């Protein structure tokens, strides 16, 4: 369920040339409870200076994402939500 | 992956089916819960009868459901009948659920807390043995003369399993709108709940005064000044309630016990 999935760190390895990209980003939302071809997953990954909001679809052989926390961490979800909101409002040019 | 040939939620025709393509579409609110459905011309929504605004439409729906729960039936016109039937089904669902949240939601929706209580008292035991479609809608062959709109008689199904309205005959209305409704000869000895009986007696005794006769004659005068035809003169009008008529109606009420 949402309350137990959102907020979990996700390790995503994307097979891209010339070197696969390795990211770690918390779950922000899920589109399906059980497994499905339209499962969907919303992940916020922040690098050293880059913040991105990825929507990884399930079943792609090149986009291998694994959930590792095994738990929800709703407070961590809230913290990451606030971080993304502040970064998104800041990034606009003024 | 690519996008559909028509991207975004595009309003289709009234009788066009679903598309079943990936489209980011949001609902206004959770319409799956009773009495929270949306009105529209698609198939997932109730047929929106004509109203000045969605607020006015919801007010009309609330008064419709209130009168429906009050007198067990309602004669409506046009697209109001499917909405009334579906909302009556929703009310029966809430009554059978019988949660405190269901009580509070039906109280938020209805105009009468006494009708909320009457529903939650009668409808569970009345429709315990029914799965769905608790209300029946019958299209009448007579139309409203003013706007030629199609009329529909909407009612509840389990008439005999109900505490109130047990044995009531709706083939013809009562003699007066404040008198108790007709009763078949077979169910003459039936008895009504005392609280509903007292409420009806109070509301009916409201109309037994002379100030109501004055309101009646003044309404005659108003509708005659407003150009409405076939409205007699307040000199030719006669009161709806008199002493001998009340006496014989009391005799008939004691006969029906």
């Amino acid at each position: 369920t949402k309350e137990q999935i959102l907020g979990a760190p996700v390790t995503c390895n994307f097979e891209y040339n010339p070197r696969p990209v390795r990211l770690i980003g918390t779950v922000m939302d899920a589109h399906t409870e059980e497994t499905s071809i339209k499962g969907g997953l919303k992940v916020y990954a922040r690098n050293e200076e880059t913040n991105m909001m990825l929507w990884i679809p399930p079943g792609n052989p090149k986009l291998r994402h694994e959930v590792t926390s095994t738990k929800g961490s709703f407070q961590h979800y809230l913290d990451e939500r606030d971080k993304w909101d502040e970064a998104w409002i800041t990034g606009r040019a003024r | 992956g690519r996008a559909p040939p028509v991207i975004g939620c595009t309003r289709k025709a009234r009788y066009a089916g679903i598309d079943d393509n990936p489209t980011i579409t949001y609902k206004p609110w959770d319409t799956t819960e009773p009495l929270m459905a949306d009105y529209g011309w698609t198939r997932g929504k109730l047929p929106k009868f004509r109203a000045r605004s969605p607020f006015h439409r919801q007010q009309i729906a609330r008064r419709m459901v209130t009168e429906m729960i009050r007198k067990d039936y309602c004669i409506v016109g046009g697209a109001r009948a499917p909405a009334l039937r579906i909302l009556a089904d929703h009310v029966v669902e809430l009554a059978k659920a019988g949660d405190t949240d269901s009580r509070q939601q039906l109280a938020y929706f209805l105009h009468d807390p006494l009708m909320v209580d009457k529903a939650f008292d009668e409808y569970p035991r009345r429709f315990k043995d029914m799965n769905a479609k608790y209300a029946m809608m019958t299209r009448l062959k007579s139309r409203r003369r003013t706007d030629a709109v199609a009329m529909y008689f909407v009612e509840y199904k389990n008439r005999d399993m109900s505490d109130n309205h047990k044995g009531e005959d709706y083939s013809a209305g009562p003699e007066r709108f404040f008198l108790p409704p007709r009763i078949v000869e077979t169910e003459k000895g039936i008895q009504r709940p005392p609280h509903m009986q007292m409420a009806f007696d109070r509301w009916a005794s409201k109309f037994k005064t002379e100030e109501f006769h004055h309101w009646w004659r003044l309404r005659h005068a108003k509708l005659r000044y407003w150009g409405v035809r076939n409205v007699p003169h307040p000199s030719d009008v006669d009161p709806l309630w008199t002493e001998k008529e009340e006496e014989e109606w009391h005799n008939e009420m004691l006969a029906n016990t």
């Binding site: 309350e3 137990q4 | 405190t100 009580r103 109280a107 938020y108 807390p113 006494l114 909320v116 209580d117």
Partner: protein, 214 residues
């Protein structure tokens, strides 16, 4: 409220029971899901005149009370009207909102105590005296029994201060014993029925009766 799902197994509350509520047995392996436990909604208890007067009578008996032993005192009270600790907490919250009692914290034992407000202490005393007179009028006894009770009351009044305190302790412990004994023979059934007031709000009307169990 069931013994297994809402409380750990083995515990039971010595108080008034709800009418027609079955005390069904729950298996020992029963456990709630972490997500299912969040969406649990309890029915509202009665914070009305009878429960608040009962709790005020207990708080007037024990001057002052402590929140830990308050449930024990309520269980020892003969005419208990509370359903469980949740009902007790709700009645305490209602009394706090109405201003009958206040909650202080002792800096010595680091525990919360429930004191009676000075402005409402007179009304609490009036309620306690009216309840005592009602219990006296309802209690039935013969001439000799009434004479013996009056003599015992006169003796307890003529006794000293510490003598009266020890007599009160003995009397309350014997009352606790006789209540634990009589509970096996009769209980207090609480019945409820929801309704809606003129403001569209849902509230319950409650009845309290006593029924013999054999």
């Amino acid at each position: 409220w069931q013994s297994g799902v809402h409380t750990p197994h083995g515990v039971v509350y010595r108080g008034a029971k709800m009418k027609n509520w079955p005390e069904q047995r729950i298996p020992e392996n029963f456990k709630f899901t972490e997500e299912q436990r969040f969406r649990t909604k309890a029915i509202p208890r009665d914070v009305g005149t009878i429960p608040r007067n009962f709790v005020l009578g207990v708080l007037y008996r024990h001057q002052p009370c402590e929140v830990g032993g308050l449930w024990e005192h309520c269980t020892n009270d003969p005419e208990i009207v509370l359903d469980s600790k949740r009902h007790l907490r709700e009645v305490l919250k209602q009394a706090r909102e109405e201003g009958f009692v206040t909650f202080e914290r002792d800096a010595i034992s680091n525990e919360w105590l429930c004191f009676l407000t000075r402005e409402r202490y007179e009304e609490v005393q009036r309620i306690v005296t009216a309840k005592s007179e009602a219990v006296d009028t309802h209690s039935g006894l013969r001439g000799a029994a009434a004479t013996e009770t009056s003599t015992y009351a006169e003796k307890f009044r003529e006794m000293n201060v510490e003598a009266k305190e020890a007599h009160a302790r003995r009397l309350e412990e014997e009352v606790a014993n006789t209540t634990r004994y009589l509970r096996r023979f009769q209980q207090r059934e609480i019945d409820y029925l929801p309704y809606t007031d003129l403001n569209g709000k849902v509230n319950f009307m409650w009845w309290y009766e006593t029924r013999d169990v054999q």
